[PDB]
């Protein structure tokens, strides 16, 4: 018998991104080669199968720094982290291959699917 | 030039509620008279002006237990915590006054507004 506030989930996500921008209660640093990204573990886990597996591990759940594979492109990771916090994906000809590879690694299927579609359309 | 995944924010919220149900990475207990509720500080802060003020305080941000005013109804708090994590509000004739009072205390304006509307319609 519940009523539902349509904009609630998007407002929560906007507010989580505002906390990230102000560095409020961020609890992990993701390191991608020479670059560092501060984030909230729960948001990473709610978006990515890889982060869900990492932060449910009894030892890794306690880590404050996670180093990604050196093959991962920092710009590709930045674009996906922004997508996690905003639902918006800055997909461009110049970054699509790095974004797709990063989304495969992070196990973000919806992103992998749109990248495949955009690549197929250019063929 | 971004593309947007429409269902992303709702999927994130569903996944945060799945983490709450399994008690994964919950970092605070809210105590309401004899009742305890485990939650994630970032979700509380993203939904409630009161929790935003609490967890941005330099001393209270470190607390693992927060005790609410004894006047707050635990069922009213449970309904609002479920709304935070799902966008669904279980508003009923038998709970509307407790829900409205709890939403005023938690500074959740959209909930206060719908309660006022439902009360006014019954007059």
């Amino acid at each position: 018998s519940c009523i539902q506030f349509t904009r609630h989930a998007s407002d929560v996500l906007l507010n989580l991104n505002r906390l990230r921008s102000r560095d409020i209660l961020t609890d992990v640093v993701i390191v991608v080669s020479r670059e560092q990204f501060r984030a909230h573990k729960t948001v990473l886990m709610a978006c990515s199968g890889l982060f869900y597996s990492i932060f449910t591990d009894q030892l890794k759940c306690n880590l404050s720094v996670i180093n990604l594979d050196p093959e991962i492109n920092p710009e590709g990771f930045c674009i996906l982290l922004d997508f996690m916090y905003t639902s918006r994906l800055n997909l461009r000809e110049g970054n699509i291959m790095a974004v797709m590879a990063t989304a495969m690694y992070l196990q973000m299927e919806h992103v992998v699917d749109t990248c495949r579609k955009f690549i197929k359309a250019s063929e | 030039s971004c593309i947007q995944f429409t269902r992303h924010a709702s999927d994130v919220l569903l996944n945060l509620n799945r983490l709450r149900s399994r008690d994964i990475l919950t970092d605070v207990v809210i105590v309401v008279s004899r009742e305890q509720f485990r939650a994630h500080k970032t979700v509380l802060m993203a939904c409630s002006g009161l929790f935003y003020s609490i967890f941005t305080d330099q001393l209270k941000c470190n607390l693992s237990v927060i005790n609410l005013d004894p006047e707050i109804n635990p069922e009213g708090f449970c309904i609002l915590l479920d709304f935070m994590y799902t966008s669904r509000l279980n508003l009923r004739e038998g709970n509307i006054m407790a829900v409205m009072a709890t939403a005023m205390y938690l500074q959740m304006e959209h909930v206060v507004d719908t309660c006022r509307k439902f009360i006014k319609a019954s007059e």
């Binding site: 539902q4 904009r7 | 959209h110």
Partner: peptide, 5 residues
């Protein structure tokens, strides 16, 4: 906003 889901 509010709707019947």
């Amino acid at each position: 906003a509010w709707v019947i889901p």
